[PDB]
Design a protein around this nucleic acid. Structure first.
Ligand SMILES: [Ca+2]
Ligand SMILES: [Ca+2]
Ligand SMILES: [Ca+2]
Ligand SMILES: [Ca+2]
Lengths: 133, 134, 134, 139, 142, 142, 139, 133, 134, 134
DNA sequence: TTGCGCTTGCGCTTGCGCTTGCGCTTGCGC
DNA sequence: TTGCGCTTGCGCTTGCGCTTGCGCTTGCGC
């Protein structure tokens, strides 16, 4: 009743369940396996929605991503995009769609270009839990 | 009689939790719901709840929170009062405009080339006390 | 020990432990009365023997009679499809008209630009006694 | 110990515990005889070795034979079709035995295979090539 | 709590969960049921992505696949009953790294989301692409 | 050189060109073959657009149409074998002028480009909408 | 004087001069007997009065009857179908006689009418309602 | 051999041919009937392409349109849009798509908005023929 | 006097005056030799009697033999379709594979994800002598 | 023997012109072509011309002009040299990137989610002297 | 690669969210 | 509204053009 299981997709695509003895260690477990490129769950449509004040020091390993100035996630490179307010300000991580990207993740934009979003940092209130330790 | 419930956390992670007894299920739903965790998918058309549950509905049951808007999985939904016609019954709907990222299967086409995405509709039915804020 | 995974009345994904396989159906009846369902409606609707239609236990699939069948917040209507002899067997179908929120894959195109969504069809087969209200 | 997840004859999602892996196929046969299935029909149908067709144990995929000899699976009827080898240098097609049915109005697009004469088929299984697996046959 | 579970789809398509005693043993369990043609999870869109230096001695049993040479001399990989051709894609410098791609032509039964439209009205379906990165030794045949 | 030609589609669908002696006689020629149900050109997308003050006494023969009241009391217009209902659309002030629209439900044989998706999964096909503008007297019944 | 534009039996776009409008239908019959057509099949098929069906002059649309009694038009065969009136207060359907064929692989989507059983039909003409037009009948 | 016919769609949608005795009067004939709202031919996909130096004094009656600050054409209102160079400078006339507009004329742009173009004024060299007399 | 409208080898739309109807076909032959065509290829291709295939005058439709048929810059291949007796008449078809520039409405879907574009089919009917090379 | 040719003018107007004799047709095509008038449509895939006509092709024949680009109906097309492969024949293609306004039926899908619109391809065939600049 | 299965009367409603420089490749399976 | 018609072996290629504040409505035909 304090125990928890989390289901990951590994670096090799495998569906693996990890047992967490203590609930409160959940984020540590996500960080641990995230550093190995394991992910849990799916990218929400439109990308993860995070508070804008979380962007500067976001722990990318939480979603199994890493910095490289790019963000690599499940073998894809995402570019950082600064969207000045005009519309609230936002910082978006996205990439150009690939021929293999299915329709439902493609976002049509100017010039017949399509984007695929990993995350957008905008609004909300900072959650210290999301930052690098 | 132990139960398990599967959640999607605020970070999207798929996590399973144990529950001692079925009578505690809703309490566990509210606890994790308050952190923005959700269990299951928004059904097509949105959740269908009894209209007499709308005024005091415990939104944490589905991982949602009031803000006069409902926030659910990073999205804001507006309250829409749909007056009965006599034939359509009265209804209170929570829905948002479609975003470029919303997949086709959740988009409801409306007048004026506007598409809506539904979170919930409170309509008809019989009030369930357990759905209200405690 | 078996485990059965339900979608609850609130859409939550909950797993129930069942001590004895002989109880499996009793457990589905029990929670089905609360409107919990397990698994998905098969494309075309569930397929049951026609000799099970008159006394079918709808709680087995989380539905209830109301003269309509209510399943996951939708009302389905009873449809007597007479046999023909160009050669069609008798059948009793439960289906509703498609809503704007119904996704393409559940819609069945019909005469007059109407689309139906199917819950169940009672056709042919051999009567299974356990499907009946005990 | 293994666990296998079934969809019952009532569509319910049920998990079974299997004490040792050597009993895996026994447990699959046992519940498959009850019409329970585990997993989805792979796109194109299951692919099995051609020399497994004659004595294939259909309960392994929760199907059964019925009398024309049809295979019943999830309340649908599938027909046995002999696809004769084509030995041209152009189109080489190996012998196959395919179990498929005409598409219904309720079948979604992703299971429909478009064919000659505006007909669509839905595949359950194809038996072709491969090498016989004894454990697939009826015991 | 040291233990893991891994979900496979067996050679008969069945959804079977296996217990693993220690995290360190994960890849070995995958190899074991992999040789039986069991797979875990889905082919990622665009195929698995592996380091180019891992291609020569990649352990295909990790993803439930096996190598097979055609009578015509084709280098093939068999995964879930489908054959994928080994394709050498030369570097271009338009900048494109060298790559080794495993893909097959689309079949009538392939859903749209796995089809990659290519030249001459051909559609390809990807299993894997070996490209860039740095070599992970654990990925190799032992 | 004072002369014009007008192309009609007859009641039998035939493509027939008619000579007109003077420009001034154009609308009268249209009325003449219009009464026979001959039409010229296509229904514009969204239906013809006419001034609202022209609706009450519009000469439907100008577009090869005719009025017809149903036994249920419906005000209808018949054009190329189809019936279009008269619909009164009240002003809204979201700003929308009052309008009188002639439209029918889509048929199975109607191509996609003429269908206007509306509420409740209904599709409408438009003949004409009377809305705004100022009255042209030539449009009226003489 | 009128001009009528035909599509010949060879598909050619040919314009004919007609000295006086009273001869219009005569000229339509004359070339229609040669299989020439003028204009397109209206969507849904031509719509003609029901009491014109029995003695309709098919050459008016460049069609002809052939022996089952079929109508041939642009090298396609159309079947006569009697659609019996439905007099319910719910669905009121007048008697009709429809000439239509099953859709071919070459028929584009805009002529295909989707029906029961995944069948598509292509319409040539429907005879229903209206009032008899004598000039439509065979002379 | 100096004669010319021009085919118009009238204000009532009718397909009418006008005989022009002298070729050189073609533009006068277009202006004359254009003032009555008659048009000849179709709007090219993407709108008519005119030289940017023709925009200030363009004779809208040439394409059967008129000013009203809007341009009315075949019963539709088009808005003038100034697109500062960044991309050459351009002046576009377009409107929001209507529910009745067929797919092939709709131009998807930001925010699920679709536009329908009448004309774009850009590049080229001024043609005095196109200006108001 | 008749008028016939051609699309020329340069795609130009040109109308030719024909003094006598009896000459109509001779005029189509004349310009067809220059690769001018009149009207459109009917959906499914032209339909001619099977007894006209062996000596068909291709210039009538602006085509020429080259063993292929060339029409408007495309090569079409001859296709002997044997009769069967489930019941198909004999037929000789002229068609080519679809190009990436071919629009959807001319494509005929076939086995192996191949699409064909049809020029003509010689099937049934009764031989029309005027269709032949004179 | 009088002919008529139908043009789309630089303003899009549909105009018909008379021609005294067929031998003057191309001269009339060039005259009006020089003003940007076109006759007929660009065929699907583009005009198909003989490769040995490319170097000195009279673009005014189709209402086009050189500028190293070809301008046609307000659009600019690039020359693309497609080397033979041995099996593909050599080819010189004039095509532009698709615009948001280009309808689907003219768009040719290529590598990299790029779509092309073709004006013309010079490939194979036999040189026609009358197609060259005089 | 295959020959083909179906049937039913219908449910609505709402104002709208936006942004980004783009990634390619392969021969093909009936 | 209707019962159903089919067949064929396949042709490729190219670097890319961009922009805009948005218009609604109707009950439905088999
Ligand atoms: Ca900190
Ligand atoms: Ca009993
Ligand atoms: Ca001036
Ligand atoms: Ca002869």
């Amino acid at each position: 009743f304090t125990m928890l299981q989390i289901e990951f997709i590994t670096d090799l695509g495998a569906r693996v369940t990890v047992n967490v003895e203590h609930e409160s260690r959940l984020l540590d477990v996500q960080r641990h396996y995230g550093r190995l490129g394991w992910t849990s769950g799916e990218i929400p449509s439109g990308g993860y929605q995070f508070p804008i004040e979380n962007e500067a020091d976001f722990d990318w390993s939480l979603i199994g991503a890493r910095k490289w100035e790019l963000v690599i996630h499940r073998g894809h490179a995402y570019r950082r995009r600064e969207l000045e307010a005009v519309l609230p300000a936002a910082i978006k991580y996205s990439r150009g769609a690939k021929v293999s990207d299915p329709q439902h993740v493609r976002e049509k934009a100017d010039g017949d270009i399509e984007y695929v979003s990993l995350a957008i940092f905008r609004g909300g209130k900072r959650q210290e839990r999301y930052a690098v330790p």
